[PDB]
Amino acid sequence: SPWFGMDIGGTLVKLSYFEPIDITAEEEQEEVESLKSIRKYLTSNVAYGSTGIRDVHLELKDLTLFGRRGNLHFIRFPTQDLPTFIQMGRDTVLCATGGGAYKFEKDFRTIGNLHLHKLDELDCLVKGLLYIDSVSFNGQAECYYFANASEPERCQKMPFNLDDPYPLLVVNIGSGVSILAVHSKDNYKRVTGTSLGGGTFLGLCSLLTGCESFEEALEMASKGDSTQADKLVRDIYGGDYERFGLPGWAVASSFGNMIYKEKRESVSKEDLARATLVTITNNIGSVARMCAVNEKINRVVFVGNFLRVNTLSMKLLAYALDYWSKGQLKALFLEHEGYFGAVGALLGLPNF
Amino acid sequence: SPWFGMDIGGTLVKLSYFEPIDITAEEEQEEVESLKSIRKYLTSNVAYGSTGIRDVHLELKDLTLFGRRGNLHFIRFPTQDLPTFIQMGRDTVLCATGGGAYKFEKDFRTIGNLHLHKLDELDCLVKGLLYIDSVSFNGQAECYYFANASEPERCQKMPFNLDDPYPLLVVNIGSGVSILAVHSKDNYKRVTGTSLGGGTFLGLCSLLTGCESFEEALEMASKGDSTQADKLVRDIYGGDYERFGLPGWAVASSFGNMIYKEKRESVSKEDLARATLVTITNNIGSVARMCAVNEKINRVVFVGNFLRVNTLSMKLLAYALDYWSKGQLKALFLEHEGYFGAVGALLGLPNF
Numbered sequence: 001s002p003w004f005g006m007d008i009g010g011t012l013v014k015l016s017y018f019e020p021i022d023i024t025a026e027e028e029q030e031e032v033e034s035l036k037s038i039r040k041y042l043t044s045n046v047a048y049g050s051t052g053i054r055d056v057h058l059e060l061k062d063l064t065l066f067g068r069r070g071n072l073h074f075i076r077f078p079t080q081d082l083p084t085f086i087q088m089g090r091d092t093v094l095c096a097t098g099g100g101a102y103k104f105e106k107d108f109r110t111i112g113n114l115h116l117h118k119l120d121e122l123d124c125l126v127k128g129l130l131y132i133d134s135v136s137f138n139g140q141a142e143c144y145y146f147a148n149a150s151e152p153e154r155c156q157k158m159p160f161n162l163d164d165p166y167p168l169l170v171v172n173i174g175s176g177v178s179i180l181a182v183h184s185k186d187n188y189k190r191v192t193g194t195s196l197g198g199g200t201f202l203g204l205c206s207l208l209t210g211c212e213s214f215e216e217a218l219e220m221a222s223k224g225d226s227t228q229a230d231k232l233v234r235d236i237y238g239g240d241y242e243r244f245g246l247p248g249w250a251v252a253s254s255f256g257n258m259i260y261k262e263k264r265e266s267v268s269k270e271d272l273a274r275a276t277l278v279t280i281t282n283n284i285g286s287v288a289r290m291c292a293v294n295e296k297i298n299r300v301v302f303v304g305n306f307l308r309v310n311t312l313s314m315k316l317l318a319y320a321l322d323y324w325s326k327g328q329l330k331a332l333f334l335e336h337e338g339y340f341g342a343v344g345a346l347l348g349l350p351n352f
Numbered sequence: 353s354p355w356f357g358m359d360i361g362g363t364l365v366k367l368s369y370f371e372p373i374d375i376t377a378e379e380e381q382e383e384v385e386s387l388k389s390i391r392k393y394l395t396s397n398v399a400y401g402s403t404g405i406r407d408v409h410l411e412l413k414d415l416t417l418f419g420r421r422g423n424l425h426f427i428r429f430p431t432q433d434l435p436t437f438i439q440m441g442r443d444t445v446l447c448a449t450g451g452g453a454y455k456f457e458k459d460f461r462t463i464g465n466l467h468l469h470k471l472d473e474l475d476c477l478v479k480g481l482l483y484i485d486s487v488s489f490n491g492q493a494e495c496y497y498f499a500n501a502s503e504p505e506r507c508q509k510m511p512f513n514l515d516d517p518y519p520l521l522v523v524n525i526g527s528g529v530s531i532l533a534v535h536s537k538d539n540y541k542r543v544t545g546t547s548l549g550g551g552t553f554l555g556l557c558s559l560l561t562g563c564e565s566f567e568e569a570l571e572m573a574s575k576g577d578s579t580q581a582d583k584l585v586r587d588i589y590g591g592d593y594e595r596f597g598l599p600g601w602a603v604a605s606s607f608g609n610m611i612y613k614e615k616r617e618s619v620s621k622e623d624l625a626r627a628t629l630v631t632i633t634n635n636i637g638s639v640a641r642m643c644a645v646n647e648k649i650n651r652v653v654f655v656g657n658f659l660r661v662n663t664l665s666m667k668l669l670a671y672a673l674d675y676w677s678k679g680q681l682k683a684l685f686l687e688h689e690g691y692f693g694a695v696g697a698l699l700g701l702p703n704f
């Protein structure tokens with residue numbers, strides 16, 4: 001049986017696949033042609049069907065896992081296309097997490113003799129995050145931060161050491177947001193969550209701009225001016241609000257300029273896309289900051305696919321967390337953002 | 353000079369006016385006809401121009417203030433129409449607060465010999481809130497809560513005593529949101545704020561539905577089903593997420609069903625209005641809860657005009673704060689929601 005872990009989320013399915021690279025001549029002879037065709041199909045293609053994608057740049061090479069050497073692959077596709085995935089399979093032990101492990105349990109069981117083992121979506125997240133950082137990203141740091149996030153002529157990605165990762169606040173930005181406090185490898189809790197997450201960005205952006213993909217939404221936002229839609233402190237005060245240290249550039253009311261009909265008539269789709277991105281990102285940062293102060297944790301790591309190919313939100317989080325915490329909190333990021341649950345699920349294989 | 357206090361916000365101007373009712377025959381003889389016409393104009397009209405409104409139901413009758421007996425009146429109009437207000441005046445000591453006291457300082461000074469005294473928008477809020485509760489609402493409680501907010505066959509408005517109001521978390525929902533921790537009459541601090549406030553509701557609702565007023569937005573929301581736009585826990589898990597006590601009805605991703613084109617094509621304007629209201633209200637509740645836990649305050653009072661004629665948001669806040677805090681926090685409301693800054697400004701008159 002191939003070694004898979006699967007995280008079936010509200011929006012995306014993430015799949016981690018361990019490809020053994022120490023196959024003997026005798027082991028290849030014992031390989032059924034269905035398994036061999038699966039391994040060939042996955043390792044010789046980077047697009048699967050019309051919506052599946054292998055993130056080749058994330059591959060971990062020559063990893064030792066369960067006493068075998070191999071490559072760890074990272075694959076994603078929309079949860080909407082899970083029926084195609086299951087039908088493809090209908091032509092084996094599956095460790096699965098995310099809400100879809102429960103919602104689609106009966107569908108996975110239409111694969112004859114398949115053993116489905118449902119694992120918790122946040123236990124899997126913590127285990128996979130700790131594992132990937134422990135093995136490194138092909139010798140490079142898995143964790144990074146933006147140094148000097150306040151001065152743009154200096155702001156640059158730099159590695160961060162998590163060899164002693166505790167305590168740690170983990171902010172998982174998926175369709176919605178879960179916030180975890182991790183005190184040890186066996187001691188973690190879900191602090192809270194917010195429903196203003198990546199699905200809010202994508203859904204509102206699609207309603208407001210007619211964009212048809214996450215990538216298009218980001219491209220629109222990169223060209224926009226959020227201050228055409230947002231009301232700033234200086235729009236209300238004429239300057240800073242000095243008494244409480246609020247600079248004139250801070251947003252006082254997200255989309256607040258859109259109460260005026262003439263402004264709604266002049267705002268561009270790109271402005272609205274950027275305002276949606278800024279609104280969602282700032283809110284996540286502020287909730288993360290409040291949770292960090294409550295949990296007395298100063299390292300906040302942001303994961304989930306809202307931040308995939310999304311440097312704008314990462315830099316906004318890095319700047320905002322540093323600025324509003326007066327330097328007490330640091331925003332951290334991980335190279336394998338969206339895949340930690342899928343890896344943690346795969347790591348549950350020995351217990352079955 | 354007439355006794356006024358003014359709070360010039362990003363969206364609305366609030367005006368508190370003390371009408372003396374113990375005028376002697378000699379005092380009426382000393383009254384200049386301009387002052388008499390001002391008093392007559394304000395007390396004989398409930399609509400002023402096309403956009404000014406006197407909230408007659410809020411009037412405090414036979415109040416003793418600065419050694420005089422009178423009626424305290426509450427008047428509002430859009431900040432966009434402040435030029436009309438100032439031009440009307442151009443045909444006197446003004447205690448003013450809100451950002452507009454700074455932004456429009458020079459405009460108020462076009463009134464010859466007018467002394468403008470700018471006061472802080474949150475100092476004025478605390479002073480006015482404490483004052484109005486102290487004098488009562490014509491013998492009735494100023495503060496109320498929703499008893500049994502979890503069972504709708506029981507949920508009802510009931511009075512709440514604030515005779516010892518400390519400590520108190522004050523959540524001011526205006527264009528944006530300010531959160532204050534009040535430990536004593538002279539000891540309060542702004543904990544944080546969020547830009548996802550009443551202007552976000554109104555601006556997003558106008559973009560999404562084409563509504564042209566706050567009242568129309570609420571009417572649309574009252575007819576809508578937010579679950580047509582929002583993705584719920586049960587949409588992701590097929591039921592509750594039992595491990596973390598998340599019920600299937602909780603919103604997992606606000607507007608998260610709007611990532612699907614077919615759902616965007618079937619959602620109604622009313623559904624979108626209600627989703628906007630729910631999204632903004634739940635986020636404010638959650639931020640308030642996190643702040644209350646951090647400040648170790650269990651009484652959270654919500655003010656500002658986002659909640660004016662907005663029973664849906666008040667009941668959502670009452671239910672949500674009680675449910676998610678497992679009964680540790682209580683949502684409180686005040687009858688004179690939007691006017692506390694204007695009253696606090698008026699109360700600053702003796703110091704000038």
Ligand SMILES: Nc1ncnc2c1ncn2[C@@H]1O[C@H](COP(=O)(O)OP(=O)(O)NP(=O)(O)O)[C@@H](O)[C@H]1O
Pocket residue numbers: 008009010011012013098099173174175176177197198199200201202214304305306307308338588604
């Ligand atoms: N190709 C993509 N398609 C859709 N959304 C994308 C894509 N790439 C990035 N995103 C963003 O990533 C978010 C989903 O992140 P992800 O961490 O995979 O969540 P999920 O696991 O599917 N949802 P959840 O059930 O809440 O844990 C979406 O809401 C988008 O903001």
Ligand SMILES: Nc1ncnc2c1ncn2[C@@H]1O[C@H](COP(=O)(O)OP(=O)(O)NP(=O)(O)O)[C@@H](O)[C@H]1O
Pocket residue numbers: 236252360361362363364365450451525526527528529549550551552553554566656657658659660690
């Ligand atoms: N007649 C109205 N016109 C506009 N907005 C209204 C009206 N009635 C209620 N609202 C709501 O009330 C909010 C403004 O509340 P308010 O407390 O008066 O804020 P403000 O003081 O003008 N703004 P701020 O500078 O942030 O303190 C708007 O964002 C709407 O959500």
Ligand SMILES: CN(C)c1ccc(CC(=O)N2CCN(c3ccc(Cl)nn3)CC2)cc1
Pocket residue numbers: 099174176177178192193194195585588593598602603604605634635636637638641672673676
């Ligand atoms: C990823 N996934 C399954 C997921 C993610 C996010 C959520 C939202 C969430 O966690 N909550 C709890 C806190 N909450 C409020 C609301 C009001 C208050 Cl007054 N307090 N809390 C809002 C809903 C749910 C599920």
Ligand SMILES: CN(C)c1ccc(CC(=O)N2CCN(c3ccc(Cl)nn3)CC2)cc1
Pocket residue numbers: 233236241246250251252253282283284285286289320321324451526528529530544545546547
């Ligand atoms: C009423 N009026 C003048 C007003 C109201 C609301 C605001 C917003 C606000 O208070 N802030 C501070 C906190 N903030 C963040 C953001 C990111 C992080 Cl990581 N942390 N905090 C956001 C902006 C400003 C002014």
Ligand SMILES: [Mg+2]
Pocket residue numbers: 009010098174175
């Ligand atoms: Mg997920």
Ligand SMILES: [Mg+2]
Pocket residue numbers: 361362450526527
């Ligand atoms: Mg205000």
